Design a protein around this ligand. Structure first.
Ligand SMILES: O=S(=O)(NCc1ccccn1)c1ccc(Br)c2ccccc12
Length: 182
């Protein structure tokens, strides 16, 4: 009977995904670090959702606020590879240099680090996992990150900021992967 946020896992989701949260979405914290975890239900099959989420060279497919994303001409999508993204004009960030940490097509886990460019999300590190759900098939996407808290900002402000980006991105991901349906 308390105030439940829409990006929080529901009880049912948590009971299905608790171990994935333990393995993939938990961070060591304390002292100028903050982290968060967001969930997005998607009425599309997990493999469709994953096929988008895994495209490290093409975040624009579903992420917002990207003027451009450039990978090298000899780009092979493997762990360690990098992308340079340019944020649309007018935001508090201009560029992000990002590195692919994780890519598991079997378990549907990917992750990246910002290493990082013109912005105030220092040492951002993020993981996204995609999961099947039944009760007739739907997907739950979990996305989390840990990131430094800028000297004169609060943890709450930092989290609100990063959460807002992730939250929109996951809405877009849901929208486009649901769009075709059948
Ligand atoms: O380059 S990004 O596409 N990184 C993906 C990303 C960045 C931050 C949080 C979640 N996900 C990006 C987009 C929009 C904003 Br506002 C950003 C602000 C700072 C750094 C990067 C930013």
């Amino acid at each position: 009977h308390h105030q439940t946020m829409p990006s929080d896992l529901t009880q049912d989701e948590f009971t299905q995904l608790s171990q994935s949260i333990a393995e993939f979405h938990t961070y060591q914290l304390g002292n100028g670090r903050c982290s968060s975890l967001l969930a997005q239900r998607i009425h599309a099959p997990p493999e469709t959702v994953w096929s988008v989420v895994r495209r490290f060279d093409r975040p624009q497919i579903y992420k917002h606020f990207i003027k451009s994303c450039n990978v090298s001409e000899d780009f092979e999508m493997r762990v360690g590879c990098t992308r340079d993204v340019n944020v649309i004009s007018g935001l508090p960030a201009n560029t992000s240099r990002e590195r692919l940490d994780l890519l598991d097509d079997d378990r549907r886990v990917t992750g990246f680090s910002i290493t990082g460019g013109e912005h105030r999300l220092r040492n951002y590190k993020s993981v996204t996992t995609v999961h099947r759900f039944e009760k007739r098939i739907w997907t739950v996407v979990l996305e989390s990150y840990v990131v430094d808290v800028p000297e004169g900002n609060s943890e709450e402000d930092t989290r609100l900021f990063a959460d807002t980006v992730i939250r929109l991105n996951l809405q877009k991901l849901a929208s486009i992967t649901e769009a075709m349906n059948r």
